[PDB]
């Protein structure tokens, strides 16, 4: 659903969807070519 999210300190509005992107244990959230939020990890539990 399109929702207002605040994850890892990143506040914004968007649709929250699951992906297969591989995150290393020490890399908390991702960035795209524009250096903007593309995929994030769950700050609470382990989830991508």
């Amino acid at each position: 659903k399109c929702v207002n999210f605040n994850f890892n300190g990143l506040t914004g509005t968007g649709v929250l969807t699951e992906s297969n992107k591989k995150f290393l244990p020490f890399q908390q959230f991702g960035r795209d070519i524009a250096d903007t939020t593309d995929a994030v990890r769950d700050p609470q539990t382990l989830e991508i």
Binding site: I33, A34, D35, T36
Partner: protein, 48 residues
């Protein structure tokens, strides 16, 4: 007829072999990519 048919074979080979052959149209995609990339990148700029 053989001169046209052989020259069209050479147009096929030239266009399939050289990456920069369509550079005049690749400059349209490249200009729009740099323009839209600068247009988004500048949203991360502080401007003071």
């Amino acid at each position: 007829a053989n001169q046209f048919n052989s020259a069209i074979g050479k147009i096929q080979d030239s266009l399939s072999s050289t990456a920069s052959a369509l550079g005049k149209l690749q400059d349209v995609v490249n200009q729009n990519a740099q323009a839209l990339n600068t247009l988004v990148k500048q949203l991360s700029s502080n401007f003071g």
